[PDB]
Amino acid sequence: SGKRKLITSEEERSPAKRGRKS
Amino acid sequence: NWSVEDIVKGINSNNLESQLQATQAARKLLSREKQPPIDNIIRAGLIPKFVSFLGKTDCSPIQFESAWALTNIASGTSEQTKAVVDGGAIPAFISLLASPHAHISEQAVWALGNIAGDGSAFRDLVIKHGAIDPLLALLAVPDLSTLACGYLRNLTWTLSNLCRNKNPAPPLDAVEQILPTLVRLLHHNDPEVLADSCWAISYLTDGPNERIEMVVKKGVVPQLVKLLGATELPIVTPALRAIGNIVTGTDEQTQKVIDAGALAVFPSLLTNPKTNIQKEATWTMSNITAGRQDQIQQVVNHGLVPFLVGVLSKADFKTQKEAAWAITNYTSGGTVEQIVYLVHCGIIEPLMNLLSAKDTKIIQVILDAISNIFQAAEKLGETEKLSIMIEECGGLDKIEALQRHENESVYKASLNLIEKYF
């Protein structure tokens, strides 16, 4: 009791996808 | 750039060199910054041809150009990533992990990272096609320093996507398989590798206590605590996330964090100029003050109660709300002497000031803390002294006003307080 997990959204996590630009 | 129509004519030519030139043209179109025409390329039917070029072992240039083109289609929306998977790309990329050409195996790592990063179903499908063994085999070197920096960064990020997402979490056997390699990456000296290793650990610890235990048993907490003190914000953010996740677990899991020295870094975290760092450090503190009385005492001993008073006094409102939770947890679990100490550090005035908030949940949290502090005061016979303090810094005014508050728990707890002590 008392512990509170943090619910994150995608914006609060590293990016899940990356395009290669060069 | 070429037009999509000309790329189609080259790719449909049945001349491998014409096909190479047109695939390269597509790669360049897809590599442009403003709105690459991913959907036009999909609608033109090119994905199955790109996937067949991944198998042309005698033409490593067309393997590389198609791998890069498909990486960038898979970096798009879920529907775009699906088109790549539906073309058969997962087993074709896994085969390329074995390529003798480092730049091709690297592009295959990157493409699989985008597919797995789409969500738990594609992450799990990449695992079912057997990606983990060949991915880990690329890192089976005595010293990571012998690998190229860009190559290692891409592998670390791709492994972090195999750790990412919930409902479901990644397969337990896959996590157990990756963790030893992840722990090596967490001890590497490159800032980007360290940041993505911390993110992966933060995803593995975002879940039930059994998942936290798998990570803690690998002995990573001391290295996380060291990364908490890094100068690079991109490292501190995920290291703090992971430590914060770990202290949502059992009391024993929280004790590993304290034992490794984490609380000595909190004076700086709780005053960090990045709002989100202060917020998550205060959230972490609140889960520590929800711990055992000996863990509350370690918070006291490290001098952190004045820092909680400070964040309660002045911070972003979301941080103040985590500080309120930390206070209510502290007063719910703490000894009478610990609660006396909290009042002597000055908690009452900033608590009372926050009762003007237009947030029902923080009011409930603060009224809980006031009641916990009164209950401590009754064991000392000093409830009268507490009422005076609360009146003198304006709290009675607001507590009385809250009797007229719309929310039920608010006016109920409020009325009780005045009836019993005022």
Q: Does the domain at residues B1-422 carry the CATH identifier 3.20.20.300?
A: no
Cross-chain CB nearest to B68 (options A2, A12, A20): A20
Distance from CA of A7 to the nearest CA of B (A): 9
**Any idea of the CA torsion for B380, B381, B387, B390, to the nearest 10 degrees?**
-10
Residues 6+ apart with CB under 8 A from B267: B303, B304, B307
Query: Tokens in use for B374?
Result: 């009164």
- State whether A18 and B113 contact (CB < 8 Å): yes
Give the span between the Cα atoms of A16 and A21, in whole angstroms.
Answer: 16
Of B253, B245, B169, the C-alpha closest to B201 is B245
A-chain residue closest to B81, CA distance: A17
**CA distance to B53, B102, B210, B309, per residue, from B14 (Å):** 12, 28, 55, 73
**Residues 1-22, chain A: which have Cβ within 8 Å of B?**
1-6, 8, 12-14, 16-22
Cα–Cα distance measured from residue B213 to residue B181, given in angstroms and rounded to the nearest whole number: 17
User: What does the alpha-carbon distance between residue B369 and residue B338 come to, in Å, rounded to a whole number?
Assistant: 13
Of A14, A21, A22, the CB nearest to B196: A14
Q: Is the peptide bond before B100 cis (omega within 30 degrees of 0)?
A: no
Cα distance between residue B400 and residue B97, in whole Å: 69
Distance CA B93, CA B128 (A): 13
Residue B159: DSSP 8-state: H
For A10, the closest chain B residue by CA position comes to B165
Residue of B nearest to A8 (CA): B206
What kind of experiment solved this structure?
X-ray
Is the CB of residue A17 less than 8 Å from the CB of residue B75? yes
Q: Which residues of B touch A12 (CB under 8 A)?
A: 276
Residues in B touching A16 (Cβ below 8 Å): 117-118, 161, 164
In the numeric block, which tokens belong to residue B385? Answer: 């002294």
Q: Do B113 and A20 touch (CB under 8 A)?
A: no
Question: Any idea what the Cα angle at residue B150 is, between residues B146 and B155, rounded to 5°?
Answer: 85
Q: How many CB atoms lie within 10 A of CB B225?
A: 21
Provide, for chain A, the percentages of residues in helix, strand and coil under a 3-state DSSP scheme, each rounded to the nearest 5: 15, 0, 85
How far off is chain A from B346, nearest CA to CA, in Å?
23
Q: Cα–Cα distance between B21 and B30 in angstroms, integer?
A: 14
Task: Nearest chain A residue to B71 by CA: give it.
Answer: A19
- Resolution of the PDB structure in angstroms: 1.9
Q: What's the CA gap between B179 and B52, in Å, rounded? A: 33
> Of B343, B350, B414, B339, which is closest to residue B422 (Cα–Cα)?
B414
Got the DSSP string for B263-321? GGGHHHHTT-SSHHHHHHHHHHHHHHHTS-HHHHHHHHHTTHHHHHHHHHHSS-HHHHH
- Angstroms from A14 CA to nearest CA on chain B: 7
Q: Judge: B195–A14 Cβ closer than 8 Å, yes or no.
A: yes
Whole-number Å distance between alpha carbons of B355 and B324 = 11
CB contact under 8 A, B249 and A8: no
Q: Does an H or E element contain B324, and which?
A: helix B317-333
CB-CB neighbours of B56 under 10 Å: 15
**Three-class secondary structure of residue B138 per DSSP:** coil
Are residues B283 and A4, on separate chains, in Cβ contact within 8 Å?
yes
DSSP state of B137: H
Q: What residue spans define the domains of chain B? A: 1-422
| B296: chain A residues, CB-CB within 8 Å | none
Q: Which one-letter DSSP state was computed for residue B87? A: T
Task: List the single best residue of B126, B233, B241 to mutate versus A (max A Cβ within 10 A).
Answer: B241
Residue A18: list chain B partners with CB under 8 A.
75, 110, 113-114, 157
**B392-420 burial string, b = 16+ CB within 10 Å, else e?**
ebebbebbeebbeeeeeebeebbeebeee
In this structure, what DSSP letter does residue B88 have? T
Burial of B7 (0-12, 13-18, 19+ CB in 10 A): buried
Pairwise CB contact (< 8 Å): B196 & A3: no
Q: How far apart are CA B11 and CA B19, in angstroms?
A: 5
Say how far residue B56 (Cα) sits from the centre of its chain.
39
Whole-number Å distance between alpha carbons of B65 and B26: 8
Q: Which residues of B75-99 are buried (b: 16+ CB within 10 A; e: fewer)?
A: bbeeebbbbbbebebbebbbebbeb
Is A18 in contact with B110 (Cβ distance < 8 A)?
Answer: yes
Q: CB-side exposure of B184: number of CA atoms within 13 Å?
A: 15
Q: Which of B287, B225, B200 is nearest to B250 (CA)?
A: B287
